[PDB]
Design a binder for this molecule. Structure first.
Ligand SMILES: *[C@@H]1O[C@H](CO)[C@@H](O)[C@H](O)[C@H]1NC(C)=O
Ligand SMILES: *[C@@H]1O[C@H](CO)[C@@H](O)[C@H](O)[C@H]1NC(C)=O
Lengths: 122, 123
């Protein structure tokens, strides 16, 4: 009894929007921000499961994770750095590296490549 | 009586941040949004004046205006379309056209070019 914006999915008191269009990580992020939400932050394994049920493999999907290179680790859009236990990222940790889900792995891709994305809010 | 974030300028109840770094219009917009603000919306001529006082000319500066091409007009980031009376824009009205101030004129540029920008928020 706390309603999601119409056409969003509700899961554990968060609301999710999975895109059909594709865009740069920045453009995706703008999309979410303008809609009072952010790119998807995965809190735990069970949430990972939920995301995976709503995703085609063979499709890079931007998530709210990127390579800072101030603290020189990957941080979520939260500002919390990634748990190297829970998550492993395949690919280079350069600047202008952003994370995407593909085949149930997280990949480093360049921020300017144009993928589907997921929005999330609480 | 209501204070601006440190190192922002106050003018008529709005706060302005003028960048030193440069980035794409989208990247700039993200920068503003993350800071609970938006790219600069010019309300009137007097505000135009204020902006111009704080800009070195011969420098493109992204502003919060772009070419929709759903309503097929320029709209501010507000969502209000351009007043062809108050403002004139030099340059093509293609998709992926965003507005930038240079030399106190507004130019259409492509969204991917990498300029200084201004953030703004109200009170
Ligand atoms: C990466 O993450 C933050 C959001 O946490 C964003 O401010 C920053 O601009 C991002 N980098 C790129 C290359 O877009
Ligand atoms: C242009 O304007 C809107 C702001 O309301 C924003 O959705 C959009 O991402 C920007 N689009 C372009 C052309 O970059």
């Amino acid at each position: 009894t706390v309603l999601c914006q119409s056409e969003w999915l509700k899961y554990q008191g968060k609301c999710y929007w999975f895109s059909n269009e594709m865009k740069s990580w920045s453009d995706s992020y703008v999309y979410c921000l303008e809609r009072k939400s952010h790119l998807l932050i995965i809190h735990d394994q069970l949430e990972m499961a939920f995301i995976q049920k709503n995703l085609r493999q063979l499709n890079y999907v931007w998530i709210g994770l990127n390579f800072t290179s101030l603290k020189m680790t990957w941080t979520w859009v939260d500002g919390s750095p990634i748990d190297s236990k829970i998550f492993f990222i395949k690919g280079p940790a350069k600047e202008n590296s952003c994370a995407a889900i593909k085949e149930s792995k997280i990949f480093s891709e360049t921020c300017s490549s144009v993928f589907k994305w997921i929005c999330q809010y609480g």
